[PDB]
């Protein structure tokens, strides 16, 4: 419905899978090799499960900024047999705003959602549950339980994961280039 569903659509079908923890089913974003994202809400374990196969959980990092704020995102290396496309060219470098952007969904009780969200603020500091969070980007759609990992791109870019909402608007954690340096 655009080159921007054209783009969330080929990101969905090859750099996503659905990882279930003791919270639930979320959306999980693969990034290169056997390194992916989910929320750090998602309390990943020592075993997660990756498209309903029991999977071994390598190594997981709840990143924070320098001030040591919460960033909400946890960075997943899988024991998986087989990698990710690397999508690492598609990240941005720095801290912006976008406009027309979608939200991508892919859950067994939620697939094939895409939800055109429209123009994203960068909105910086959120009290997201309680948790003091940085470089979050907001969105005027009101989100659910379910949406929880969605991706956020634009046409070539992919620039977040949903991580909460307030009833009226979307907030995501920014995804940068420099998270996935090895
Ligand atoms: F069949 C479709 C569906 C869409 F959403 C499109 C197009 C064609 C083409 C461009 C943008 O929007
Ligand atoms: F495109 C999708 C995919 C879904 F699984 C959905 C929706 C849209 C909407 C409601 C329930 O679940």
Known sequence: ?????????AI???NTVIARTEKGEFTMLGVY?????????????????INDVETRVLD???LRDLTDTNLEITI???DRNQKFRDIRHFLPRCED??????????????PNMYIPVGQVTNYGFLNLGGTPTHRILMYNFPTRAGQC??????TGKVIGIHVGGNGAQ?????LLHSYFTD
């Not at 419905?1 to 659509?9: C, E, I, K, L, N």
């Not at 979307?170 to 920014?174: I, K, S």
Request: charged content about 15%.
């Open 1 to 9: 419905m655009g080159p921007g569903f054209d783009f969330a659509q």
């Open 12 to 14: 969905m079908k090859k």
């Open 33 to 49: 090799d056997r390194v992916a994202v989910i929320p750090t809400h998602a309390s990943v374990g020592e075993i997660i499960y």
């Open 60 to 62: 997981a990092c709840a």
């Open 76 to 78: 997943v290396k899988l």
């Open 97 to 110: 705003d976008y406009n027309d952007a979608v939200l991508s969904v892919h859950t067994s009780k939620f």
């Open 149 to 154: 990992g969605g991706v956020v791109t634009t």
């Open 170 to 174: 979307g907030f995501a954690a920014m």
